[PDB]
Design a protein around this ligand. Structure first.
Ligand SMILES: O=C(O)c1ccc(Nc2nccc(Nc3ccccc3C(F)(F)F)n2)cc1
Length: 266
C-alpha cells in the first residue's frame, strides 16, 4: 500500500459503533466507490492513555495479517484533530449482537465459530502474535456469516511481560494475565475456552458483580455448567480453561476435537 489518503477522499455514512476514543463509520471511497469502515480516533483522547504506541502496534500488526477470518486493515492517516484507520467492512456486525439476539448459540454454530477462531489464531501465532482481547464485541461477521477477528487494540508480540492497567476486561483474561505475570500464546487458548462457554451458555463462565470477585473466580478457575451443556462441549471447555498454560491444548488438538469435528460445519 503506497499512496497517502485523506478525509476528503471519503464519504462517511452510518455510525457502526461508539467508544471513548472514537467511533467506527461505514464509509465510501469517492473515486472507486469502494465500501469500507473508517475507525476515527481522537489524538487528544488517546495521548492520555499512553496507548499511542499500542495503537501503532495494533496498526503495524493488523495491516500485515492476511486471513479470511481476520479483519483487514488497509491503511491509515491523520490530521490536526484525529487519526483514521481504513478497515475492511464486515456487513453482519458483531458476534456480540448475534448472541444478544439468539440469546445463545447451538453446538453447530458454536463449533463453527470456534473453528473459524482457531484457524485465525493459528495464523496469528505462527507470526508470534497474541491477541489477548479475544471476545464477542471484538468479533465481526462477514457476508457469508463467517467469524472475523476485528479489534487488535490489545494484541502484542510473544512472549510478553506486560502488566497493563487495562489489557481489556476481566471476563476473558487468563490467571497469568490478571496476576500480572509473564504470558504467551496460551492466553488466547484460555480465551477461546471462555468464548466457547459464552456461546453455548450465553454468559462468560466467570461472570460476577464486581471485578474483585470475578478476579477471584478466574484465578481459582471456578465455573459450573448448566444441565444443557453436552459432555463433548464440557470436555473441550475443561481442557481449555486450565490455570497452568502448558496444560492447555494446541489449536491443532482443538480443531481435531471430537465435539468440534462432529459439530463444526467448517
Ligand atoms: O449495525 C451494526 O451493529 C454493525 C454492522 C456492521 C459492523 N461491521 C464492522 N466492520 C468493520 C469494523 C467495525 N467496527 C466495530 C463497530 C461496532 C462495534 C465493534 C466493532 C469492532 F468489532 F470492529 F470493534 N464494524 C459493525 C456493527
Amino acid at each position: 500500500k503506497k499512496r497517502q489518503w485523506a478525509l476528503e477522499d471519503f464519504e462517511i455514512g452510518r455510525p457502526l459503533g461508539k467508544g471513548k476514543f472514537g467511533n467506527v463509520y461505514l464509509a465510501r471511497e469517492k473515486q472507486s466507490k469502494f465500501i469500507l469502515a473508517l475507525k476515527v480516533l481522537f489524538k487528544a483522547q488517546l495521548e492520555k492513555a499512553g496507548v499511542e504506541h499500542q495503537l501503532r502496534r495494533e496498526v503495524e500488526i493488523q495491516s500485515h495479517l492476511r486471513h479470511p477470518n481476520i479483519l483487514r486493515l488497509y491503511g491509515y492517516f491523520h490530521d490536526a484533530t484525529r487519526v483514521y484507520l481504513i478497515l475492511e467492512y464486515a456487513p453482519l456486525g458483531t458476534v456480540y449482537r448475534e448472541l444478544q439476539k439468539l440469546s445463545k448459540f447451538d453446538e453447530q454454530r458454536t463449533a463453527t465459530y470456534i473453528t473459524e477462531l482457531a484457524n485465525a489464531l493459528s495464523y496469528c501465532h505462527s507470526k508470534r502474535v497474541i491477541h489477548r482481547d479475544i471476545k464477542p464485541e471484538n468479533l465481526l461477521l462477514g457476508s457469508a456469516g463467517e467469524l472475523k477477528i476485528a479489534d487488535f487494540g490489545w494484541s502484542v508480540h510473544a512472549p510478553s511481560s506486560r502488566r497493563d492497567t487495562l489489557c481489556g476486561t476481566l471476563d476473558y483474561l487468563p490467571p497469568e494475565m490478571i496476576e500480572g505475570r509473564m504470558h504467551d500464546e496460551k492466553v488466547d487458548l484460555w480465551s477461546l475456552g471462555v468464548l466457547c462457554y459464552e456461546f453455548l451458555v450465553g454468559k462468560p463462565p466467570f461472570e460476577a458483580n464486581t471485578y474483585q470477585e470475578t478476579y477471584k473466580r478466574i484465578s481459582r478457575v471456578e465455573f459450573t455448567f448448566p444441565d444443557f451443556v453436552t459432555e463433548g462441549a464440557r470436555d473441550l471447555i475443561s481442557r481449555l480453561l486450565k490455570h497452568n498454560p502448558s496444560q492447555r491444548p494446541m489449536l491443532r488438538e482443538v480443531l481435531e476435537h471430537p465435539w468440534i469435528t462432529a459439530n463444526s460445519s467448517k
